[PDB]
Amino acid sequence: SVIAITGSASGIGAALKELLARAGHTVIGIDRGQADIEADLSTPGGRETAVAAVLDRCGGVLDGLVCCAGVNSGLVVAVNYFGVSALLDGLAEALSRGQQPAAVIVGSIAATQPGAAELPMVEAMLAGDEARAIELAEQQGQTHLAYAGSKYAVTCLARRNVVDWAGRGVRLNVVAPGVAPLGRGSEPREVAEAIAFLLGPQASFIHGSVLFVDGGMDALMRAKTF
């Protein structure tokens, strides 16, 4: 499979890149630097450039997409929400043309922060109004609030488009990485393994799911919420 990965140059994206390469897949890496495709996903121009470059590289046909790129509050909203949505939307056609195509967004357990759902930022993001979402985040003035709000919104975005993606024949799921009950934090490779699972043919009936990979933390803190 030919799989595009944003944030391929560090952390989870880099671990996934390595994992998939070792497993025999072809990886198109997209990141700010040290990548096949170097682009700034915080701007519409960077997103446009990255989408065109991916399409060129894969000949308009793509088997997988993983959005891992993430990071003032305006920048947080621009990268973590709109840098994901522009890439998903820009590459949806190419994915629809691929072989058992699937995509994964790397969310965060911060998406479950109490009150995130009610942040004005969030409505603007889900409406697709970037200028208004950035303005709202900047007047809120807390980067960590923008982080939680963007992760909440991007997780909602995945689920809300479950019908559109099904219609294209492309699965779309979220991985929500996380002391946890398991007594440690995760290695980037462990998150990468969950992503690779969701991308692959073993997950052929999994669509619109949010898979927590957090050593039990969400179960401990939100037992009743599922």
Ligand X SMILES: NC(=O)C1=CN([C@@H]2O[C@H](COP(=O)(O)OP(=O)(O)OC[C@H]3O[C@@H](n4cnc5c(N)ncnc54)[C@H](O)[C@@H]3O)[C@@H](O)[C@H]2O)C=CC1
Closest of 155, 160, 195, 206 to residue 65, by C-alpha? 195
Question: Residue 79 carries which side chain, given as an amino acid letter?
Answer: V
Using CB under 6 A as the binding rule, whether residue 157 contacts ligand X is answered as no
Site membership for ligand X, residue 194 (CB under 6 A): no
Q: Which of 2, 51, 79, 86 binds ligand X (CB under 6 A)?
A: 79
User: Is 147 an active-site residue?
Assistant: yes
Instruction: State both tokens at 149.
Output: 């709000």
Cα distances (Å, whole numbers) of residue 152 to 64, 74, 80, 81, 92:
23, 16, 10, 9, 22
Q: Which does 216 bind (CB under 5 to 8 A by kind): a second copy, ligand X, none?
A: a second copy
User: Was 59 annotated as part of a binding site?
Assistant: no
Question: What 3-state class would DSSP assign to 226?
Answer: coil
Span interacting with ligand X, options 40-48, 118-126, 162-170, 216-224, rule CB under 6 A: 40-48
39 burial type by CB count under 10 A (0-12 exposed, 13-18 middle, 19+ buried): buried
Query: x/- site string to ligand X, residues 2 to 21, per CB under 6 A?
Result: -----x-xxxxx--------
Query: Was 8 annotated as part of a binding site?
Result: no
CB of 221 to ligand X, least distance (A): 14
Nearer to a second copy, 34 or 202 (CB): 202
Choice between 55 and 210, CB closer to a second copy:
210
Cα within 13 Å of Cα(107), Cβ side = 30
Touching ligand X, residues 90-129 (CB under 6 A)? 106, 108
Tell me whether residue 70 is annotated as binding: yes
Contact 153, 124 (CB under 8 A): no
Kindly state the helix (H) or strand (E) to which residue 46 belongs, with its residue range: helix 44-58
Q: How far apart are the first and last CA of the chain?
A: 32
Gap between the Cα atoms of 21 and 59, Å rounded? 20
Contact partner at residue 155 from a second copy, ligand X, none, CB < 5 to 8 Å by partner kind: a second copy
Q: Which does 79 bind (CB under 5 to 8 A by kind): ligand X, a second copy, none?
A: ligand X
Q: Which listed option, a second copy, ligand X, none, makes contact with residue 106 (CB within 5 to 8 Å by class)? A: ligand X
Catalytic center residues = 147
